Amino acid sequence: RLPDSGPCGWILVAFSFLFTVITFPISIWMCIKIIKEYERAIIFRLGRILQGGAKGPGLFFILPCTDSFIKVDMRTISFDIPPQEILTKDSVTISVDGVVYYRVQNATLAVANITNADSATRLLAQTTLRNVLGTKNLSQILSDREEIAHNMQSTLDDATDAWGIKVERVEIKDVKLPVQLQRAMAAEAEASREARAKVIAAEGEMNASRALKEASMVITESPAALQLRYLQTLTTIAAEKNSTIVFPLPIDMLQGI
Amino acid sequence: MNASRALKEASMVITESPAALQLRYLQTLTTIAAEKNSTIVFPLPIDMLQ
């Protein structure tokens, strides 16, 4: 799979052979290359790419005048995506903070078919995450990891194949609602605790009721006692750090008009 | 028009016992109180037994 993108050569090659031998105890260090188990090399000689696949591990020789040399790490790499602003299918504004893991699958395509594989891959992960979550309600986003991952993978594989890249994971490390929505969306949790509080409060009413009845039966034998309790309530209330408005009301004067 | 059928069903059940609609009113007030700039004016009818 190739990427989508002579007599005078021997003279330059011979000149380079001679020059490097003339400079041998210095230039041999530039000629020699060592590629580790987990690396691959892409080599051009007079602009043509050396026949076959990417060069494997071991010891290799190049002439720096006529040859160009690119070295590719084949290991998995992880990148912490910058945070994004997203809209859910139900139209909720959320900000998410992603992470992507990816690996070079074909070293030749990664070098010769795309200008910058890393930037292409990292941007593609952002736009793919933006799209998929726009097809889900907020509740589905929290519950449907496996389905969401499956949807992204097919999208990513179709695009990254030509770049020689395999994306292995995309995941989310933070999700935030804007502050104006936070209590409104929490209604279900708030209601459950209020429901249990109501049961506790009603039990308190029942426990206190007997003493109030006993107090009432004494008070009603001289009914003006309730007005004395009323006036003491006003004195207690006035002491709190709040505004109190009081209206003395001469009812017998009003009774006259 | 789309919402009307469910409201009719809810109304028919609620109206079979008199206090039910009043409970719905009070729950609404509790929901209102959480929003900003919501002033509530609350009468307390009291009897001094004269």
Ligand code: NA
């Ligand atoms: Na991130």
